[PDB]
Amino acid sequence: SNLTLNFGPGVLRLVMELSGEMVRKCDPHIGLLHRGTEKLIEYKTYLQALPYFDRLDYVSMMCNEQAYSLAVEKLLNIQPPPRAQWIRVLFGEITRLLNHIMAVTTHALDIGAMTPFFWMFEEREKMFEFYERVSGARMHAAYVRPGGVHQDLPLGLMDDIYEFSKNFSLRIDELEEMLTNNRIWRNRTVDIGVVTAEDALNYGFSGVMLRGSGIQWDLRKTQPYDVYDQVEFDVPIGSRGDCYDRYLCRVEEMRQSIRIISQCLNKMPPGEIKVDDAKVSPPKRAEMKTSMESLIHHFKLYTEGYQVPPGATYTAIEAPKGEFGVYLVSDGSSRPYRCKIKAPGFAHLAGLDKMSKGHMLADVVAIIGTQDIVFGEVDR
């Protein structure tokens, strides 16, 4: 016989079959945050369905906004204006900094290193000030929309993003001073959760979960979206497939996100921020209150919403947790017929059982840390 531990209720239920110190079986029971998001999406318009995507990976809000917006814009056969695309890449990499701070610092907090959590969440508070200045909300911005973004950058925001970005690499340096060469942090991560490249491909892993195993794959490079082919950055590649190389990949992705943010601040073009098709994006309020066509289009976009032509797309981005996909099916109406949400954490938490075999019970919280799991996107 062997021990069965029911680690009850982010929130997760775990059914462990242990054989002493070792883990024989790990059965993650989920659905504790299943909210039926993508059934609720079927009864709402495309604009009304957008704020559900803020709340899936709720540390990667504008990235999921971007993925849903790219899906709807692909089905609408329209493209965002260039300044909107540069704002989306800028705030997508700010979002990537947010998520990797959350990932690395809570993964260190669950192992026992509680202090760089507090050090990096002040930087995270400043990036939430950036979200609040651009949209009015600290987390669920509802800002990146199909057609572009909702509102242009306020004056003086890019200077403050520059003042943040100029100092953030020292914050990464002192995080990396606390953890990377620390022998206690290395003993908790170096031989832990080793995934081969073939098993990572076969188990549907994506993002750092592939790149820690040496797979040279990044969707911003291979299948590029808005203006990621115009920014220059490197892709950190692991060598041993463990928790420690995935940690180093996330730290170096924060480095490369700072690099992309500097390039976005220097290459921000002038122009409009919504697509100038007023049958898709709402007109400005000054012309809504002056022009008859603009008032009609405002009325119909905020009550019926735009009709999307019939068809199905699978649109994926390189979200900070991995490949975030939307399989969006439109029937021709102004509401989605079907919206399957592909989250990286779903397949990663499915691979948790293989990743935890032969390890200890204290290694399982490290493996649940290195798979960056937010249960909003896992459960929908």
Partner 1 sequence: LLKKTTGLVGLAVCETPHERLKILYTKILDVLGHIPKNAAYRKYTEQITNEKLSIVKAEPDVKKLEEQLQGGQIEEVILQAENELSLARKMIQWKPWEPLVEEPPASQWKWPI
Partner 2 sequence: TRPTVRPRNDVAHKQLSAFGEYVAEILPKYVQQVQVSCFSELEICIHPDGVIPVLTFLRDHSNAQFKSLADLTAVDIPTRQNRFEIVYNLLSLRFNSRIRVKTYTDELTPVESSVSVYKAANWYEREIWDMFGVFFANHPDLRRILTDYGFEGHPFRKDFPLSGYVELRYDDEVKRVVAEPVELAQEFRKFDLNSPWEAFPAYRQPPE
Partner 3 sequence: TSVKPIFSRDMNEAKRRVRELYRAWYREVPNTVHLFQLDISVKQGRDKVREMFKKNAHVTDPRVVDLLVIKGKMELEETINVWKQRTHVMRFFHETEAPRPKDFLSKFYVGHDP
Out of partner 3, partner 1, partner 2, none, which partner does residue 157 contact, by CB within 5 to 8 A per kind?
none
- Write out the binding residues for partner 1, residues 216-255 only, by CB under 8 A: 216, 237-241
Contact flag: residue 18 with partner 3 (CB under 8 A) = no
Does 214 sit near partner 1 (CB under 8 A)?
yes
145 interacts with partner 2 by CB under 8 A: no
Q: Is 197 in the site for partner 1 (CB under 8 A)?
A: yes
43 binds partner 2 (CB under 8 A): yes
User: Per rule CB under 8 A, is residue 360 in the interface with partner 2?
Assistant: no
Closest CA to 319 of 217, 161, 169, 206: 206
User: Residue 269 corresponds to which amino acid?
Assistant: P
Q: Please say which residue, 43 or 118, places its beta carbon nearer to partner 1.
A: 43
- Residue 106 binding target from partner 1, partner 3, partner 2, none, CB below 5 to 8 Å by type: none
Give the bridge partners for 311, in sequence order.
330
At 193, which amino acid appears? Answer: G
Residue 34 amino acid letter: H
Interaction between residue 29 and partner 3 (CB under 8 A):
yes
Encoded tokens for 20: 């002493």
Residue pair 257/265 in contact by the 8 Å Cβ criterion: no
Q: Which of 365, 242, 235 is nearest to 373 (CA)?
A: 365
Lookup result for tokens 């009550």 = 303
Does position 198 interact with partner 1 (CB under 8 A)? The reply is: yes
* Binds partner 2 by CB under 8 A, chosen from 350, 360, 361, 365: 350
Contact between 12 and partner 1 by CB under 8 A: the answer reads no
x/- map, 267-296, partner 2, by CB under 8 A = --------xxx-------------------
Contact between residue 327 and residue 314 where contact means Cβ atoms under 8 Å apart: yes
Is residue 34 at the binding interface for partner 3, with CB under 8 A as the rule? no
Which among 233, 232, 227, 317 is positioned nearest to 269, based on CA atoms? 227
Q: Does 202 contact partner 3 by CB under 8 A?
A: no
Beta carbon of residue 1, minimum distance to partner 3 (angstroms, whole number): 15
- List the one residue from 92, 116, 305, 336 that touches partner 2 (CB under 8 A): 305
Which residues are CB-neighbours of 304 under 8 A, at least 6 positions away? 45, 334
Distance CA 156, CA 147 (A): 24
Burial class (CB in 10 A: 0-12, 13-18, 19+), 360: middle
Chain breaks in the chain (C to N over 2.5 A) after: 9
Binding-site partner at residue 15 among partner 3, partner 1, partner 2, none, CB < 5 to 8 Å by type = partner 3
Query: Shortest approach of partner 1 to residue 241 CB, angstroms?
Result: 4
Extract the tokens encoding 160. 């403050």
Query: Can you tell me the distance from the alpha carbon of 205 to that of 348, in angstroms, rounded to the nearest whole number?
Result: 6
Interaction site with partner 2 (CB under 8 A): 30-31, 34, 36, 38-40, 42-43, 45, 73-79, 81, 199, 201-204, 206, 215, 217, 222-223, 275-277, 303-305, 307, 309-314, 316, 323, 325, 327, 329, 332-335, 337-338, 340, 342, 346-347, 350, 379-380
